[PDB]
Scaffold this active site. Structure first.
Site, PDB file in Angstrom:
ATOM      1  N   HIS A 184      16.778  13.697   2.244  1.00  0.00           N
ATOM      2  CA  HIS A 184      17.479  14.166   1.055  1.00  0.00           C
ATOM      3  C   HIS A 184      18.448  13.099   0.501  1.00  0.00           C
ATOM      4  O   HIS A 184      18.452  12.821  -0.713  1.00  0.00           O
ATOM      5  CB  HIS A 184      18.233  15.460   1.411  1.00  0.00           C
ATOM      6  CG  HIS A 184      19.140  15.956   0.335  1.00  0.00           C
ATOM      7  ND1 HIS A 184      18.817  17.023  -0.471  1.00  0.00           N
ATOM      8  CD2 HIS A 184      20.356  15.522  -0.082  1.00  0.00           C
ATOM      9  CE1 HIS A 184      19.794  17.228  -1.339  1.00  0.00           C
ATOM     10  NE2 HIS A 184      20.739  16.331  -1.125  1.00  0.00           N
ATOM     11  N   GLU A 185      19.261  12.488   1.364  1.00  0.00           N
ATOM     12  CA  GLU A 185      20.195  11.475   0.863  1.00  0.00           C
ATOM     13  C   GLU A 185      19.413  10.283   0.301  1.00  0.00           C
ATOM     14  O   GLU A 185      19.717   9.793  -0.799  1.00  0.00           O
ATOM     15  CB  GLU A 185      21.161  11.005   1.958  1.00  0.00           C
ATOM     16  CG  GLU A 185      21.979  12.114   2.627  1.00  0.00           C
ATOM     17  CD  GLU A 185      22.611  13.101   1.661  1.00  0.00           C
ATOM     18  OE1 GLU A 185      22.933  12.718   0.510  1.00  0.00           O
ATOM     19  OE2 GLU A 185      22.808  14.267   2.072  1.00  0.00           O
ATOM     20  N   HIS A 188      18.209  10.815  -3.140  1.00  0.00           N
ATOM     21  CA  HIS A 188      19.184  10.524  -4.184  1.00  0.00           C
ATOM     22  C   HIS A 188      19.134   9.022  -4.492  1.00  0.00           C
ATOM     23  O   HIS A 188      19.094   8.628  -5.656  1.00  0.00           O
ATOM     24  CB  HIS A 188      20.604  10.907  -3.725  1.00  0.00           C
ATOM     25  CG  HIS A 188      20.910  12.372  -3.817  1.00  0.00           C
ATOM     26  ND1 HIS A 188      20.786  13.090  -4.988  1.00  0.00           N
ATOM     27  CD2 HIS A 188      21.389  13.242  -2.894  1.00  0.00           C
ATOM     28  CE1 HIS A 188      21.174  14.338  -4.782  1.00  0.00           C
ATOM     29  NE2 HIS A 188      21.545  14.456  -3.520  1.00  0.00           N
ATOM     30  N   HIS A 194      19.294  17.139  -7.502  1.00  0.00           N
ATOM     31  CA  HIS A 194      18.935  18.357  -6.794  1.00  0.00           C
ATOM     32  C   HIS A 194      17.951  19.197  -7.593  1.00  0.00           C
ATOM     33  O   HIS A 194      17.939  19.154  -8.827  1.00  0.00           O
ATOM     34  CB  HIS A 194      20.184  19.189  -6.505  1.00  0.00           C
ATOM     35  CG  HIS A 194      21.095  18.568  -5.496  1.00  0.00           C
ATOM     36  ND1 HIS A 194      22.448  18.831  -5.455  1.00  0.00           N
ATOM     37  CD2 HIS A 194      20.849  17.695  -4.491  1.00  0.00           C
ATOM     38  CE1 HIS A 194      22.997  18.143  -4.468  1.00  0.00           C
ATOM     39  NE2 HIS A 194      22.050  17.447  -3.865  1.00  0.00           N
TER      40      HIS A 194
HETATM   41  C1  LIG Z   1      20.755  18.122   3.608  1.00  0.00           C
HETATM   42  C2  LIG Z   1      21.572  18.834   2.532  1.00  0.00           C
HETATM   43  C3  LIG Z   1      20.675  19.265   1.368  1.00  0.00           C
HETATM   44  C4  LIG Z   1      22.712  17.942   2.039  1.00  0.00           C
HETATM   45  C5  LIG Z   1      23.785  18.726   1.286  1.00  0.00           C
HETATM   46  C6  LIG Z   1      24.761  17.784   0.595  1.00  0.00           C
HETATM   47  C7  LIG Z   1      24.088  16.948  -0.470  1.00  0.00           C
HETATM   48  O1  LIG Z   1      23.700  17.463  -1.524  1.00  0.00           O
HETATM   49  N1  LIG Z   1      23.940  15.660  -0.135  1.00  0.00           N
HETATM   50  O2  LIG Z   1      23.344  14.779  -1.031  1.00  0.00           O
HETATM   51  C8  LIG Z   1      24.525  19.630   2.261  1.00  0.00           C
HETATM   52  O3  LIG Z   1      25.023  19.165   3.287  1.00  0.00           O
HETATM   53  N2  LIG Z   1      24.548  20.929   1.889  1.00  0.00           N
HETATM   54  C9  LIG Z   1      25.365  21.880   2.645  1.00  0.00           C
HETATM   55  C10 LIG Z   1      24.528  22.847   3.487  1.00  0.00           C
HETATM   56  O4  LIG Z   1      23.561  23.426   3.005  1.00  0.00           O
HETATM   57  N3  LIG Z   1      24.944  22.973   4.763  1.00  0.00           N
HETATM   58  C11 LIG Z   1      24.538  24.161   5.514  1.00  0.00           C
HETATM   59  C12 LIG Z   1      24.262  23.791   6.977  1.00  0.00           C
HETATM   60  C13 LIG Z   1      25.565  25.304   5.454  1.00  0.00           C
HETATM   61  O5  LIG Z   1      26.777  25.079   5.529  1.00  0.00           O
HETATM   62  N4  LIG Z   1      25.018  26.532   5.327  1.00  0.00           N
HETATM   63  C14 LIG Z   1      25.908  27.690   5.443  1.00  0.00           C
HETATM   64  C15 LIG Z   1      26.834  27.786   4.229  1.00  0.00           C
HETATM   65  N5  LIG Z   1      28.213  28.047   4.679  1.00  0.00           N
HETATM   66  C16 LIG Z   1      26.297  22.653   1.688  1.00  0.00           C
HETATM   67  C17 LIG Z   1      27.188  21.658   0.927  1.00  0.00           C
HETATM   68  C18 LIG Z   1      25.471  23.464   0.676  1.00  0.00           C
HETATM   69  C19 LIG Z   1      27.192  23.608   2.500  1.00  0.00           C
HETATM   70 ZN   LIG Z   2      22.405  16.068  -2.416  1.00  0.00          ZN
END
Ligand SMILES: CC(C)C[C@H](CC(=O)NO)C(=O)N[C@H](C(=O)N[C@@H](C)C(=O)NCCN)C(C)(C)C
Ligand SMILES: [Zn+2]
Length: 254
Positions: A184-185, A188, A194
């Protein structure tokens, strides 16, 4: 595609946190993990048909793996991405992810100018479940070093960088999960933004294979589409890949 320029060579850095907690404090264990991870991530990229035709075979390979075995000793007031404390809240386990990416970019600027992409692998628990961050496909940067003069830093930094942490909510994430973060990173870096809920094709329901890799909300990787790029991502990376390959892509080693 130009087989002479179809591979984005990477500078991979593992800070002391990753080395201690993921590498067991062993170079071999640390580099093995990263070499295998990038390879699996590469499998995703090499096999993707950006134009749904024959425009494929584009991927990534590690040029250099730097291992910072101990924290970077700094002078008071001075900060470094590999220092022992987190910034700006030294009480928290991790840095503010955005400030960390900027700092990493500032610190490895010299090495970053000589590569297609630089990626930092760390082991710190970012707030609210964030796993990584990278430049490219925003609101500039991504593959191939593009300079940006930092008034605060007083030098040119490059935006061909990103980072991945393999720790979330107090534990080491599964390898299948780590693969997803880096894909994913790097996505980008390759120009993808996204996937929006507004386009069903790019953000399918769970019964349609689930979401694609560039969806903003983490995907376990237990659904079919999870480890693949949507059509939206393909179109973006396709546009980006063209104007960039000739610039900094190289020939695959092997
Ligand atoms: C691999 C993923 C797509 C990266 C993104 C961050 C991103 O867009 N980086 O370019 C992320 O960590 N997303 C988190 C995520 O999905 N983490 C999960 C583990 C989470 O916390 N899920 C439960 C929600 N409280 C967010 C910011 C949405 C919380
Ligand atoms: Zn991202």
């Amino acid at each position: 595609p130009d087989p002479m320029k179809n591979t984005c060579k990477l500078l991979v850095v593992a800070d002391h946190r990753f080395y201690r907690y993921m590498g067991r404090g062993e170079e071999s264990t640390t580099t093995n993990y990263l070499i295998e991870l990038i390879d699996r991530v590469d499998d995703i990229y090499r096999n993707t048909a950006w134009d749904n035709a024959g425009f494929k075979g584009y991927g990534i390979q590690i040029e250099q793996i730097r291992i910072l075995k101990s924290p970077q000793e700094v002078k008071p007031g001075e900060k470094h991405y590999n220092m022992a404390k987190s910034y700006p809240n030294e009480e928290k386990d991790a840095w503010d992810v955005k400030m960390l990416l900027e700092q990493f970019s500032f610190d490895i600027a010299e090495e970053a100018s000589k590569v297609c992409l630089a990626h930092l692998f760390t082991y710190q628990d970012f707030d609210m479940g964030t796993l990584g961050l990278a430049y490219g496909g925003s609101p500039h940067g991504g593959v191939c070093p593009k300079a940006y003069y930092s008034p605060v830093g007083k030098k040119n930094i490059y935006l061909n960088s990103g980072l991945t942490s393999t720790k979330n909510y107090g534990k080491t994430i599964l390898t299948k999960e780590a693969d997803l973060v880096t894909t994913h990173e790097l996505g980008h870096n390759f120009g993808a933004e996204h996937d929006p809920d507004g386009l069903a094709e790019c953000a399918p329901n769970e019964d349609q294979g689930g979401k694609y890799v560039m969806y903003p909300i983490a995907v376990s990787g237990d659904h079919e589409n999870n480890k693949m790029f949507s059509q939206c991502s393909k179109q973006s990376i396709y546009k980006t890949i063209e104007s960039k390959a000739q610039e900094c892509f190289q020939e695959r080693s092997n």
